[PDB]
């Protein structure tokens, strides 16, 4: 039989092994002739394994580098300007790798140029309640000051964004070793930690869903109109730069000025982690200086897509995308991923060259530029959004496989619950001690739901990959899994978008055997395989309307902080009680009705009405200031792109409201956002009622 | 046999005339009891004609009315502030109903309060051209002076735009009879012209399609957040007030300052046209004071929403729409059609009872508030607009049935000139001289297409009516039709919005047999029926490949005025005509697979390409500070809301481009618009295209 098992049984951990160790010998930095010829690579083996079709599509976007023979650094220098200390110009290259070229030094993508000298002020995390700490609260002015900030907890654009809003005229980000190196095991190439000469890439845009800077709306063609660098969506303003921690250490060590506030903004380095401004008595008079050079620059990427076409829906679109494009050798982040995605696009192209075809169509994507902010995924989805506005199904994402190798992670929407429970309990569990067992006994075992015994977490999406333009603007069922670490025994992975995450790191420190990969694989091509087969779509309404009454009970007791202003400005939760309570009435009589339909109209018409359940929680008009993120339930934080909020509007209107100059007019806007996610939620429901 | 032909028989003159009578008799004012009652009526009647469910929609919306015990009117004050004359508080009312109580006396809807005093300058019609030559080339400043403007050429409400943009304190609109008043044809109630006492209503808001000025984006329901007054959409700044020409001519023979600057500018009263400002040597102390007292109101309305459910696809709807509510008695406008959709549920209904039902849904509408700014259709689209998006197939109009007794008016989509043709050509024409001959023949001979001889002229959508939130908005493919008199041999019909329009104006002089009215039955009821009823979408997409080709030749031509600008700024029109190419190409693939595919999701596939094919026009962004019309290919014209203007985001940024002051940046907006409009045509085209 051609069924899911057969599918799933065609997937083999050596087969992603040998994927990964192809795809990580070179770097595929993004616009770069490496990552094109990669990209060539993939779409003739795509066609070899059996897909109908596999074309690349490409658009000019703008990218960022550092200038080759103008190198990045930071400088302490003293009163006559001698540079007496400098950051160093590039990580030492991991063993056998030290004659690779075309490795990209550690930098900020999209920095401005610069060479900015001041006073340093320690900022811990760079977070908003760090920034409310230090001006509120300590009485320290950042307006004219660099900042220096540590890795950890929040997006580094967020960090960006918040030390600009306090005036400060640049930001140094550093990995301290409390956040990337665990206790107990050894740095790179000996264990899987961060060593001090370590540096994290990554950009610093807050592009807020809008994809190309100068192309918000519509794809980055040929004859795209582009804005304008002076009016290009989310680039900063100030100077930015990483380094690793035996840098921190030296322009850490001399800082003055105020005693850190309490113990959670003393990292792990041998520093009184002093916020400032500037260093104590004998160095008061040397200063930071940033030298910046490096140029943004419109340039071409590549997305491969891949299409394995529906025998009975091909006009209903299943979605399987991850990224190609790496900051250096991309070990972990993207190619343990891609590997995967190879894997699965091989097995099901079996599977084709049988006989078989899917029910509905599947579309296969490695997109480009993800590094850069969601680049790829997002100008494809402006040039294919009414394709996909109508016809999409679903979009399961296929970044980094593995994170750890404790136990499974997934974040997707309510609608999928279900779809995820039912899976694993049919998949074996890889985890020691749990042979014999499926992976949802392992999984739940070790990541309990806080909710309900008996089940596992599953989280919100937040942002931060190549599903935010699918989920939080075009409003397409979308989920995501890989596996990861016990965070209840450091920050992401140690070695994430440094030199050191190789094809090395993860054969001999986190999957040797690949059987996390192939567990991973069997989750991500399972989801496909049931989105794509299932005669009626996997989703369960129902599961929307317990997460929607947990959120309205928090946001409810977030404004209940406030008593006396919700009964000055008569603030009522009331139409969103009543709208979410209608909401769990209509799901429940509807899946009466899916249990209780041989006729195909009925059938579509209720797949249909499954598919466009996601969709209704789109608002055309997008959250206030953020047209791109239009989805009313989630979007990813404001102060935070990583992790998802729930009402994000109601959230954001209510959030530091206290501070607020006009209270009736903060209040009005409250109830604002209550009427809109009313509403909103009301008209989802209404989706779901008898259609006449 | 159930077929069109027992639909169509179906339909009685006689019976559209009875209910045309009962529709009559008292006025039915937007949130007024006496419309609320009517709105019962109808609801009980549909139910008893069939229909499967027939609910009342209603909402809180802002009207407007005067004050019953501070009428408003006009003097002309002397130095002393003597009120010498003081224009008309009503309408002489018609013979047999000068004791009907509750006749609205004329006001412009909207305005606000004011008594302001000031120097009359005559305008002309108040359109764009006229305030150019004006002040561009008469040197006149109308800046603190009261305008006075005649009705015709162009939406009442742009005028008062106009001329609040141009620095006017006030605006006194008056019926020239030069536009009302047909040559030798008496007044009512002896003929069809308009009396010198006779005044036309009418709301002067700017909406731009945002429905309720207080709600844009959302329902106005029970627990809807209002904007303030003054963040409200569209009110005017300055006072207006409508006028008969007896009291114009009092206004405008004293008149001095310059003469008309051509006949153009002069009407039909004996009075010399001068612009001024201000009065000639006698007068010239003498002022003019404006009084308005009218108040802005949220108000409850009602919109009647009638279901008969499809048989094969309950999930697909067919809207025919028209609205209840009239200024006074409504005898044209909106009875006359009203009257029609009431016949057409009734034939519906007769089949439905004998076991027919329609392939797919027919939804009927009784619209409130039409003319207080499309604010009944508007909101009920706000609240449904998830389910309209994925499931409108088509929007029918169904406002006044005649405005004369010559031939057959059509504005629709593209998608629909196949099915009027074809239709047409199956009915009787009900002119004298074409006994025995088709409506085709007898059209097409009336009013031959300026394009193609052979076929009838049959124009594009503009707006001013309740189709402008499903086409302009939502993207659903829509259409209207109406008899209208012989352009060729004044300016609406000249009763309208006044309190002659009644009854016996239809019966004894524009349709006695009933037969215009008969015909119109037959044309939007046939629509109704092919659009519900035919297996293949009855729409022809190469016809958008046509009239897009047309388009793209005239805003080229208009770009070509300044061939120096486009070659300095490198102004292509390459792209769109590309697309243009691109969109004829796939649409006659595509109409080659309709021909040629028992498979009824290759069927129902090729539907919903069909349906989503007007769809795909829309733009999420909508058009430059214009976020309610999405739709790139028509949007309302910005100097004339009741015409529609193609390409018109191209259209706007090259209006008057010589006169910018930084061209660069004009040009460069030029550029942009073609780029959204060639990106927004091939997207369109490959939605036609094979699905995977
Ligand atoms: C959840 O679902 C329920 C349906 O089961 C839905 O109930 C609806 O609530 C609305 C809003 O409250 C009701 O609106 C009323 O409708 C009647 C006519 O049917 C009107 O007379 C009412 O207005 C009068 O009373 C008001 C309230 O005091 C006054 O403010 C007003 O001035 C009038 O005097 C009122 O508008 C509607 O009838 C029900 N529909 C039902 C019960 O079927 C509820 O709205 C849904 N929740 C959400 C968030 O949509
Ligand atoms: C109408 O339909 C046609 C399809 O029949 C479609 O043609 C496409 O045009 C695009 C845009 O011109 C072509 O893009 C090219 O693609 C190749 C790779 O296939 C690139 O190498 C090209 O880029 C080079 O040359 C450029 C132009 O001089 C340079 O600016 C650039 O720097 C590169 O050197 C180029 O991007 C595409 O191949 C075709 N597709 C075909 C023919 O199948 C046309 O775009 C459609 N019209 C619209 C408005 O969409
Ligand atoms: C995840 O798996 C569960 C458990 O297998 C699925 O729920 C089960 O789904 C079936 C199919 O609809 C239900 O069967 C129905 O039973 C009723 C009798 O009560 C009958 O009228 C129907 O014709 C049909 O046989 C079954 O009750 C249900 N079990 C539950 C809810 O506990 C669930 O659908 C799966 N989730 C997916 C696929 O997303
Ligand atoms: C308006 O009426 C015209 C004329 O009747 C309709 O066009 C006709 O439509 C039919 C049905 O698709 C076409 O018939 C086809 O002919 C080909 C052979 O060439 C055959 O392969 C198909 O199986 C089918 O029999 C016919 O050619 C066509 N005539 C034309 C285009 O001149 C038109 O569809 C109607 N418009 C509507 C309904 O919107
Ligand atoms: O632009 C854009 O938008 C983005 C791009 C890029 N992209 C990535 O890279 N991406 C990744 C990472 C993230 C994650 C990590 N990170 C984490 O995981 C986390 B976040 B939250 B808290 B925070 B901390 B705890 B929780 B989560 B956890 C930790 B962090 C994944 O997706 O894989 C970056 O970012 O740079
Ligand atoms: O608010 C809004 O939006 C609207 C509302 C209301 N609504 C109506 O009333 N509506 C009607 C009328 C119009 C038409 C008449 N008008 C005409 O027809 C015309 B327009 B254009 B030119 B101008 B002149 B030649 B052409 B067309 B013809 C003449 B006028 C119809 O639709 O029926 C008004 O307007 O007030
Ligand atoms: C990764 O695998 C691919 C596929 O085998 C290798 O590409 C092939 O290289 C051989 C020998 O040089 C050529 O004959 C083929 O034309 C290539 N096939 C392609 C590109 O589809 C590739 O060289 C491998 N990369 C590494 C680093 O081992
Ligand atoms: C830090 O780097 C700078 C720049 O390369 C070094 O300063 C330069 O030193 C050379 C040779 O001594 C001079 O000719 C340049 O004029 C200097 N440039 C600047 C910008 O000062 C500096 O020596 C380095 N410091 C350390 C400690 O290595
Ligand atoms: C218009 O027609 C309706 C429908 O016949 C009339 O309403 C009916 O009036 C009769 C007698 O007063 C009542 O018994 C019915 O209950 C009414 N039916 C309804 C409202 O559905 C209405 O009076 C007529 N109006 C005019 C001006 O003739
Ligand atoms: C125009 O109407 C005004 C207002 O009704 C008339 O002026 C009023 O006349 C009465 C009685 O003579 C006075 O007591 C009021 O003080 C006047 N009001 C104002 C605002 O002036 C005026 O007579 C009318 N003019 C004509 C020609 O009829
Ligand atoms: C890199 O280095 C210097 C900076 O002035 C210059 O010679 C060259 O133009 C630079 N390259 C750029 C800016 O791309
Ligand atoms: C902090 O920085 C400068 C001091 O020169 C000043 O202009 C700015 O207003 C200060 N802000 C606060 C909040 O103290
Ligand atoms: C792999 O699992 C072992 C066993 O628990 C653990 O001690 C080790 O830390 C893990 N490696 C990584 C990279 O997490
Ligand atoms: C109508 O007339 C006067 C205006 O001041 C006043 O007595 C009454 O309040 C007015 N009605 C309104 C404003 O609705
Ligand atoms: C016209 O009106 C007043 C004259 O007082 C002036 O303020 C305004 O600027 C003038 N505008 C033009 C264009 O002449
Ligand atoms: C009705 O038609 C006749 C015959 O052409 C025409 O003379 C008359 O003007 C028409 N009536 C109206 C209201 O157009
Ligand atoms: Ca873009
Ligand atoms: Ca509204
Ligand atoms: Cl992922
Ligand atoms: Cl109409
Ligand atoms: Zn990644
Ligand atoms: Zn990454
Ligand atoms: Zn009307
Ligand atoms: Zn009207």
Same mark, same amino acid.
């Given at each position: 039989?051609?069924?899911?098992?057969?599918?799933?049984?065609?997937?083999?951990?050596?087969?992603?092994?040998?994927?990964?160790?192809?795809?990580?010998?070179?770097?595929?930095?993004?616009?770069?002739?490496?990552?094109?010829?990669?990209?060539?690579?993939?779409?003739?083996?795509?066609?070899?394994?059996?897909?109908?079709? *596999?074309?690349?599509?490409?658009?000019?976007?703008?990218?960022?580098?550092?200038?080759?023979?103008?190198?990045?650094?930071?400088?302490?220098?003293?009163?006559?300007?001698?540079?007496?200390?400098?950051?160093?110009?590039?990580?030492? &290259?991991? &063993?056998?790798?030290?004659?690779? @070229?075309?490795?990209?030094?550690?930098?900020?993508?999209?920095?401005?140029?610069?060479?900015?000298?001041?006073?340093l002020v320690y900022v811990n995390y760079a977070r908003t309640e760090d920034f409310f700490k230090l001006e509120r609260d300590m009485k320290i002015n950042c307006?004219?000051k660099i900042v220096i900030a540590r890795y950890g907890k929040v997006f580094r654009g967020n960090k960006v964004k918040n030390a600009?809003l306090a005036?400060a005229?640049?930001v140094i980000l550093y990995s301290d070793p409390a956040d990337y190196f665990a206790p107990?095991?050894?740095?790179?190439?000996?264990?899987?930690n961060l060593?001090?000469?370590?540096?994290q890439?990554?950009?610093?845009?807050?592009?807020?869903?809008?994809?190309?800077?100068?192309?918000?709306?519509?794809?980055?063609?040929?004859?795209?109109?582009?804005?304008?660098?002076?009016?290009?969506?989310?680039?900063?303003?100030?100077?930015?730069?990483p380094i690793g921690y035996?840098?921190a250490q030296?322009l850490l060590e001399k800082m003055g000025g105020s005693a850190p506030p309490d113990s959670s903004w003393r990292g792990s380095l041998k520093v009184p982690y002093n916020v400032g401004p500037?260093?104590?008595?004998?160095?008061?008079?040397?200063?930071?200086?940033?030298?910046?050079?490096?140029?943004?620059?419109?340039?071409?990427?590549?997305?491969?897509?891949?299409?394995?076409?529906?025998?009975?829906?091909?006009?209903?679109?299943?979605?399987?995308?991850?990224?190609?494009?790496?900051?250096?050798?991309?070990?972990?982040?993207?190619?343990?991923?891609?590997?995967?995605?190879?894997?699965? *696009?091989?097995?099901?192209?079996?599977?084709?060259?049988?006989?078989?075809? &899917?029910?509905?169509?599947?579309?296969?994507?490695?997109?480009?530029?993800?590094?850069?902010?969601?680049? +790829?995924?997002?100008?494809?989805?402006?040039?294919?959004?009414?394709?996909?506005?109508?016809?999409?199904?679903?979009?399961?994402?296929?970044?980094?496989?593995?994170?750890?190798?404790?136990?499974?992670?997934?974040?997707?929407?309510?609608?999928?619950? @279900?779809?995820?429970?039912?899976?694993?309990?049919?998949?074996?569990?890889?985890?020691?001690?749990?042979?014999?067992?499926?992976?949802?006994?392992?999984?739940?075992?070790?990541?309990?739901?806080?909710?309900?015994?008996?089940?596992?977490?599953?989280?919100?999406?937040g942002?931060?990959?190549?599903?935010?333009?699918?989920?939080?603007?075009?409003?397409?069922?979308? +989920?995501?899994?890989?596996?990861?670490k016990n965070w209840e025994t450091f920050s992401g992975y140690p070695?994430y978008?440094?030199?050191?995450?190789?094809?090395?790191?993860?054969?001999?420190?986190?999957?040797?055997?690949?059987?996390?990969?192939?567990?991973?694989?069997?989750?991500?091509?399972?989801?496909?395989?049931?989105?794509?087969?299932?005669?009626?779509?996997?989703?369960?309404?129902?599961?929307?309307?317990?997460?929607?009454?947990?959120?309205?009970?928090?946001?409810?007791?977030i404004?209940?902080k406030?008593?006396?202003? #919700?009964?000055?400005?008569? *603030?009522?939760?009331?139409?969103?009680?009543?709208? *979410?309570?209608?909401?769990?009435?209509?799901?429940?009589?509807?899946?009466?009705?899916?249990?209780?339909?041989?006729?195909?109209?009925?059938?579509? #018409? #209720?797949?249909?009405?499954?598919?466009?359940?996601?969709?209704?929680?789109?608002?055309?008009?997008?959250?206030?200031?953020?047209?791109?993120?239009?989805?009313?339930?989630?979007?990813?934080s404001s102060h935070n792109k990583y992790a998802?909020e729930?009402? &994000?509007?109601?959230?954001?209107?209510?959030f530091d409201?206290e501070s607020?100059?006009?209270?009736?007019?903060?209040?009005?806007?409250?109830?604002?956002?209550?009427?809109?996610?009313?509403?909103?939620?009301?008209?989802?429901?209404?989706?779901?009622?008898?259609?006449?």
């Amino acid at each position: 039989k051609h069924n899911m098992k057969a599918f799933l049984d065609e997937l083999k951990a050596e087969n992603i092994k040998k994927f990964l160790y192809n795809f990580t010998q070179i770097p595929h930095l993004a616009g770069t002739e490496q990552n094109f010829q990669l990209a060539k690579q993939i779409q003739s083996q795509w066609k070899e394994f059996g897909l109908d079709s *596999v074309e690349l599509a490409h658009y000019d976007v703008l990218l960022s580098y550092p200038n080759k023979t103008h190198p990045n650094y930071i400088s302490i220098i003293n009163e006559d300007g001698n540079e007496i200390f400098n950051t160093s110009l590039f990580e030492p &290259p991991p &063993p056998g790798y030290e004659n690779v @070229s075309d490795i990209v030094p550690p930098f900020s993508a999209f920095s401005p140029q610069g060479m900015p000298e001041g006073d340093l002020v320690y900022v811990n995390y760079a977070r908003t309640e760090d920034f409310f700490k230090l001006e509120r609260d300590m009485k320290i002015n950042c307006s004219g000051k660099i900042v220096i900030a540590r890795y950890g907890k929040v997006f580094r654009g967020n960090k960006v964004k918040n030390a600009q809003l306090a005036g400060a005229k640049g930001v140094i980000l550093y990995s301290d070793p409390a956040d990337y190196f665990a206790p107990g095991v050894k740095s790179y190439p000996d264990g899987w930690n961060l060593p001090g000469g370590g540096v994290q890439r990554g950009n610093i845009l807050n592009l807020n869903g809008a994809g190309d800077p100068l192309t918000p709306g519509y794809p980055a063609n040929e004859y795209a109109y582009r804005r304008g660098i002076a009016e290009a969506v989310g680039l900063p303003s100030i100077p930015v730069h990483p380094i690793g921690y035996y840098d921190a250490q030296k322009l850490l060590e001399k800082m003055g000025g105020s005693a850190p506030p309490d113990s959670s903004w003393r990292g792990s380095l041998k520093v009184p982690y002093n916020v400032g401004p500037g260093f104590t008595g004998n160095f008061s008079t040397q200063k930071v200086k940033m030298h910046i050079h490096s140029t943004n620059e419109v340039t071409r990427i590549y997305n491969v897509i891949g299409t394995l076409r529906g025998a009975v829906e091909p006009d209903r679109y299943v979605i399987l995308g991850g990224h190609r494009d790496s900051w250096v050798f991309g070990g972990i982040d993207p190619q343990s991923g891609a590997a995967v995605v190879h894997e699965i *696009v091989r097995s099901f192209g079996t599977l084709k060259k049988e006989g078989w075809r &899917p029910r509905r169509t599947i579309l296969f994507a490695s997109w480009d530029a993800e590094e850069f902010g969601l680049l +790829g995924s997002t100008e494809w989805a402006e040039e294919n959004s009414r394709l996909l506005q109508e016809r999409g199904v679903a979009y399961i994402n296929a970044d980094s496989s593995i994170e750890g190798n404790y136990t499974l992670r997934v974040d997707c929407t309510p609608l999928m619950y @279900s779809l995820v429970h039912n899976l694993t309990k049919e998949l074996k569990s890889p985890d020691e001690g749990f042979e014999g067992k499926s992976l949802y006994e392992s999984w739940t075992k070790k990541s309990p739901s806080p909710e309900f015994s008996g089940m596992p977490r599953i989280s919100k999406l937040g942002s931060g990959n190549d599903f935010e333009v699918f989920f939080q603007r075009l409003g397409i069922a979308s +989920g995501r899994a890989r596996y990861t670490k016990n965070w209840e025994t450091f920050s992401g992975y140690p070695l994430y978008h440094s030199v050191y995450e190789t094809y090395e790191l993860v054969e001999k420190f986190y999957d040797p055997m690949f059987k996390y990969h192939l567990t991973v694989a069997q989750v991500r091509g399972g989801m496909v395989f049931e989105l794509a087969n299932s005669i009626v779509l996997p989703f369960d309404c129902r599961d929307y309307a317990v997460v929607l009454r947990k959120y309205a009970d928090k946001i409810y007791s977030i404004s209940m902080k406030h008593p006396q202003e #919700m009964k000055t400005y008569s *603030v009522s939760f009331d139409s969103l009680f009543s709208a *979410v309570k209608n909401f769990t009435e209509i799901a429940s009589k509807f899946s009466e009705r899916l249990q209780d339909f041989s006729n195909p109209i009925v059938l579509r #018409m #209720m797949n249909d009405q499954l598919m466009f359940l996601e969709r209704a929680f789109i608002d055309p008009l997008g959250l206030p200031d953020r047209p791109f993120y239009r989805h009313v339930i989630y979007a990813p934080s404001s102060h935070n792109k990583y992790a998802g909020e729930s009402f &994000p509007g109601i959230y954001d209107a209510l959030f530091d409201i206290e501070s607020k100059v006009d209270p009736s007019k903060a209040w009005g806007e409250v109830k604002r956002q209550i009427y809109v996610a009313a509403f909103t939620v009301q008209a989802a429901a209404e989706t779901l009622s008898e259609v006449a």
